[PDB]
């Protein structure tokens, strides 16, 4: 009578497969608002 082959694994080998990696490319960077000009002139200078 021939012996049937071995068909067993440890839980580590079938559950802990070397996993694929998550998406490394996650770049975010907020833009800079365009500044507005300065439009003031002191009251002594405006009219004296």
């Amino acid at each position: 009578p021939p012996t049937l082959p071995f068909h067993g694994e440890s839980a580590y080998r079938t559950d802990y497969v070397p996993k694929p990696l998550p998406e490394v490319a996650k770049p975010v960077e907020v833009k800079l608002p365009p500044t507005l000009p300065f439009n003031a002139q002191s009251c002594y200078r405006s009219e004296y």
Binding site: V28, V30, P33, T35, L36
Partner: peptide
């Protein structure tokens, strides 16, 4: 450094930044 908790929802002036009815005529 992912400054989302400083992500401006305001502008240079203080305020903040930019985010039916069937009328009986």
């Amino acid at each position: 450094l992912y400054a989302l908790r400083d992500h401006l929802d305001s502008k240079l002036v203080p305020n903040q930044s930019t985010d039916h009815t069937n009328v009986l005529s």
